[PDB]
Amino acid sequence: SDKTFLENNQYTDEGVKVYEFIFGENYISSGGLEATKKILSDIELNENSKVLDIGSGLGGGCMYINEKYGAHTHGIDICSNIVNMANERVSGNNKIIFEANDILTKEFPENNFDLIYSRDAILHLSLENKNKLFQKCYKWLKPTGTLLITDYCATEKENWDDEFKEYVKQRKYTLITVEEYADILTACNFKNVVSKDLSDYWNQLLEVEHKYLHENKEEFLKLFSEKKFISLDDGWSRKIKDSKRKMQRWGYFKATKN
Template structure:
């Protein structure tokens, strides 16, 4: 049965949030005020009422043929959380492009849109389904009984709402969806998705970082004073738009409702994004390693380590801990291989996607990025020819389980290439090294133990190469070049930042020289 949309007083209220400035948003109508809901809604309704209810109009793309529409739908549905047997609220349902698909698996679907003609066509197409109900309503004025739905689905909705409206709607959605329920959001970031020319364009093209912030930083408090928030579990560019247009700015976000308290809300993702990998921190590392790189040696070690893999255009590669995309871009440009990069840091992925848009078309179309926890993710068996990871797995506790996943995801004969921080073979490590490892949350093995773990899960031809001497040589060179660029760095950042980086590199050299820290290069093959 369709869910009854009982109108009710709002039981939840938004807590104070620390939303970042949105001065970078691109708005084409000068008199469209983010803080004036009436103005925004009126403009939006006027904007959409000028279009006929058709796929081209919904996608604002003259090339919105059956192929593009079908590929777009397929990936959106694959990206969504499990919908089978779930109560689904579809916001901004339009003419029902997704309602039809949602109805095939969901227990119930409630489709909402604020344009009556669109709702009428959706009802005409999908009204034969007894478990689908329809409503013409403005989502900003919608009130629904708390905990009514398992999943809330929206496709191209928030980009037509001002910041205040998105904040308020996020709090409402937190009340509408059950605890551990999901929100799926798909939006155009930075620029339009299609090519239909418009006299006016009342759209807010936010950055991925702004969506991560606005969707995760709002809090709902229920009648029992329990607080809830959304945590983004996955975000990725929509493959159809990359493949057809080289456009990485169509992003889908999967968020889970969870209690907001000190124990459950603090996550490793927030630790990374708030400490070592803040946007400013990433840019400091990039200054040393080179544009788009955040791993030891930058482009030079990437070229050196990738060459023996004998990559070709027919191969697909998974880049685990892809950072801001340097290795992925190099591999796509040099070898033509398809690369899918995955990283837990929202800041890393936001920057990687932005850099992707600046690359030549062949590279843009060969690379895709995803924000996700690789330890909780799953790809189909025998998906990739190569799994590549640079200085990332040091963060992961259960390397055994991760390497078992690598083994499953690789095709027979597929290869892994990993570089990673390790600890030296000495029995008693210095107090400074132990403190450093604890502060960073690293989980280190010796080079030998690392290789043995790869063998344990089934890999063959395992090579565990201690590259500590090369690592120290690279550190010395990076430190030398860094000092030559001191004035430029301080102009961009600060004297304190320079000292922090310089001391960090010198400390690595001391730890390696004392036998505390090591650096390993690991290669292995999945049996045929």
């Protein structure tokens, strides 16, 4: 059911291409390549490392991790159409694998990965499933491994306004506070749990993206439609407003198995 909802609405082929337009080639989330460089700036891996990317999208993250470190990267994404697109973006590289599957039913061996990485994907999971997923991640990490996440978070639900309630409802997101998120990781026995509210940085990424959209409107209209432009424009406007006033937050989380 989840698969069909995502494939048929938010992540249709065209929806994915619209995201790629504003985020940059191979990315469909916040800050594209430049944010990825920053998020991985203190991460150490090498050609012998094994990495899992949960919700791998068009595969940009896997491509970058493999380029930077030479690591084995395995991306899982529930949307078959997105995985098909990702597979067209990489060739002749036996250390990048993209696989269409629900991360919640996927099986991996215990103590398997040096890094489990996820960028703006876990918002799609119910609270019960976030907990289940992080339990799986704990098992799947090597003793020496690291968990590294960015995800959409929010102020406490009691504070939400009508527009924000509707945004979350229509997308079927489950947005929790940065603090609740960190508490889940702690409950799952992760160590050295570091959470950062990166909402200010996120706001900066959004502003750069918004400016890019405006300055490249003519090309956007040629590729897509004015209707799609307006939707995207308004969507970024709201994210900028809501991040500034702390209604919507961008959470970063890093933790270790030991």
